[PDB]
Amino acid sequence: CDAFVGTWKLVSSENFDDYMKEVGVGFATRKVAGMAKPNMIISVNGDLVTIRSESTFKNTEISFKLGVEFDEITADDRKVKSIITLDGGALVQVQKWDGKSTTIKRKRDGDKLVVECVMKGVTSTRVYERA
Amino acid sequence: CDAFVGTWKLVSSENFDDYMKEVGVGFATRKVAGMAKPNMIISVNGDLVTIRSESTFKNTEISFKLGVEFDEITADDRKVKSIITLDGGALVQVQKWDGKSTTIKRKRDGDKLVVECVMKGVTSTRVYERA
Numbered sequence A, B: 001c002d003a004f005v006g007t008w009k010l011v012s013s014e015n016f017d018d019y020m021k022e023v024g025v026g027f028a029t030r031k032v033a034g035m036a037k038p039n040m041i042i043s044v045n046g047d048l049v050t051i052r053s054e055s056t057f058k059n060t061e062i063s064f065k066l067g068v069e070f071d072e073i074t075a076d077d078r079k080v081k082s083i084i085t086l087d088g089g090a091l092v093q094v095q096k097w098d099g100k101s102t103t104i105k106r107k108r109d110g111d112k113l114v115v116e117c118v119m120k121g122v123t124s125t126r127v128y129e130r131a
Helices: A016-023 A027-035 B016-023 B027-035
Strands: A006-014 A039-045 A048-054 A060-064 A070-073 A079-087 A090-097 A100-109 A112-119 A122-130 B006-014 B039-045 B048-054 B059-064 B070-073 B079-087 B090-097 B100-109 B112-119 B122-130
Touching: A016 A027, A016 A112, A016 A122, A048 B070, A060 A070, A060 A079, A060 B059, A060 B070, A070 B048, A070 B059, B016 B027, B016 B112, B016 B122, B059 B070, B059 B079
Parallel strands: none
Antiparallel strands: A006 A039, A006 A122, A039 A048, A048 A060, A070 A079, A079 A090, A090 A100, A100 A112, A112 A122, B006 B039, B006 B122, B039 B048, B048 B059, B070 B079, B079 B090, B090 B100, B100 B112, B112 B122
């Protein structure tokens, strides 16, 4: 996870609302969540990887081991099962709940960290740079 | 857990610095941690309990099931194993790392939430009220 460790600030967001719609986030909530500009703080301690997200909407944190399924309460209050892997040099997260699934891919592109969240063929792209 | 769900704000802190010393928290961290006045936000989603701490020092979160050991990275960056129980109507947390242990007790006392953290017979006491 060496390529991912650091504090990342949001530089661009594309198609976030439509992704949230696909996920089932409420109309009012999508407004508030759309206004947030979360940072992403990624760190490692031993075999535990932590991804923190800090914003006006919600402060979240997941702590996990690569390849080991874990319980997560999402920023929009879904209770999901997540599994995160190192796959083609990306961190790939699959979240499953209520027979549904979404894939969140975190990948380096030049000096940026690109986050692509996919649900039913709808993709939100968020671009981050080091703080 | 119903008696614990809510947003709690710090109202008193007693012996916090000495507790941190006993834990082995370094001077500079103890200073910044002592200056912070963290909220504590406790929520439940199915069988998952989440305890979030928000302050200038750190934003942290643990999500866990009662009676099931889990991995935790503490605010002072210790990698510990935690187990949390409902015991005499209190939430009792035991954190273990490097052959050491500390116990964190969260209990209701009237309209307050009293948090007692014990390390080798040094006790820090922090009291919170609903926000």
